[PDB]
Amino acid sequence: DWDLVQTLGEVQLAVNRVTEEAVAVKIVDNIKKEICINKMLNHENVVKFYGHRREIQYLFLEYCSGGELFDRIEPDIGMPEPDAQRFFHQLMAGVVYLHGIGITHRDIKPENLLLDERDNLKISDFGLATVFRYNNRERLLNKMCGTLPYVAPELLKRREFHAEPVDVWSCGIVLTAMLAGELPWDQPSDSCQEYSDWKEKKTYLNPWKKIDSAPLALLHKILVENPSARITIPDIKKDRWYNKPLK
């Protein structure tokens, strides 16, 4: 038996009457695919799925008492570089896992990155997720989704696109936010001046000016317009800043 303590955001915090264990309960009244995908998942950097009950659908998910990464980002400032690097390491671990089982999240942003009691990052909310690889066969995506400031430019420009580079791009936007406390552009389109400036290498402007040359060098490889030229995760793991001892 579980008591519903408070509304988290619908999602409610539930506490076990006997054990006092806490869990997040998602109430819905597409949910079928979210449960299906959640049943595939098992990784320390992905919100745990405990099960579901049908009545109004109920999803039981890992409660992350640390809240959202979003709330650890000080506006216009960001966070200490060592904290950002640690969070970025854990984000990559989670994303590598998902891509490894052929799943793309499609909406990576600080609001969907939760923290447990130890500040361990957990990828959250698979309502927009989809399978991009099955029976070792890649499937190109063609539906536009995600969140504009975080979406890769190809999603706005091409009919079809590879799933993995899209997630890599969004991860680069998250890193920018962690290091500068602001988003670089409303969207990565040619009509967007801020994106034009970036493509023209005007890193003497914000937010790039607040970012140290080492992490900035990594962002130069992630925020590349051509998804085929964009750095892959295995190569991100070889990046100099990625491997820099910090703090």
Binding residues for ATP: 8-11, 26
Based on CB atoms, which residue is closest to ligand YM3, 29 or 200? 29
Which residue is at the shortest CB distance from ligand YM3?
9
State yes or no: residue 63 binds ligand YM3 (CB under 6 A).
yes
24 contacts: CB under 8 Å, gap ≥ 6: 8, 11, 12, 13, 14, 60, 61, 62, 63, 64
**Residue 179: closest CA among 150, 152, 147, 214:** 214
State which H helix or E strand residue 16 sits in: strand 11-16
* Residue in 16, 42, 65, 243 binding ligand YM3, rule: CB under 6 A: 65
Does residue 11 belong to the site contacting ligand YM3 (CB under 6 A)?
yes
CB of 66 to ligand YM3, least distance (A): 7
Please say which residue, 68 or 194, places its beta carbon nearer to ligand YM3: 68
Residue 24 interacting with ligand YM3 (CB under 6 A): yes
9 forms part of the interface with ligand YM3 (CB under 6 A): yes
27, 56 Cβ separation under 8 angstroms? yes
Binding mask 80-119 for ligand YM3 (x = CB under 6 A): ----------------------------------x-----
**Helices assigned H by DSSP within the chain:** 31-38, 81-100, 153-157, 163-180, 193-199, 213-222, 233-236
Residue among 81, 85, 84, 104 at smallest CA distance from 94: 104
Q: In terms of CB distance, is 117 or 200 closer to ligand YM3?
A: 117
The answer to the question of residue 47 lying near ligand YM3 (CB under 6 A) is: yes
CA gap 186, 181 in Å, rounded = 15
CA dist., res. 21 & res. 63, Å (int)? 9
Residues with a known catalytic role: 107
- Single out the residue of 130, 168, 124 nearest to residue 11, CA to CA: 124
CA torsion through residues 83, 87, 90, 92, sign: negative
DSSP 123: E
With CB under 6 A as the contact rule, the residue among 67, 82, 100, 199 that binds ligand YM3 is 67
Stretch that binds ligand YM3, among 6-14, 93-101, 198-206, 238-246 (CB under 6 A): 6-14
Q: Is 124 one of the binding residues for ligand YM3 (CB under 6 A)?
A: yes
Site string for ligand YM3, 172-211 (x = CB under 6 A): ----------------------------------------
CA-CA distance, 199 to 24, in Å (whole number)?
41
Give the residue, chosen from 64, 152, 216, 219, that forms a contact with ligand YM3 under the rule CB under 6 A: 64
Task: List interacting residues with ligand YM3 (CB under 6 A).
Answer: 8-9, 11, 24, 47, 61-65, 67-68, 114, 124
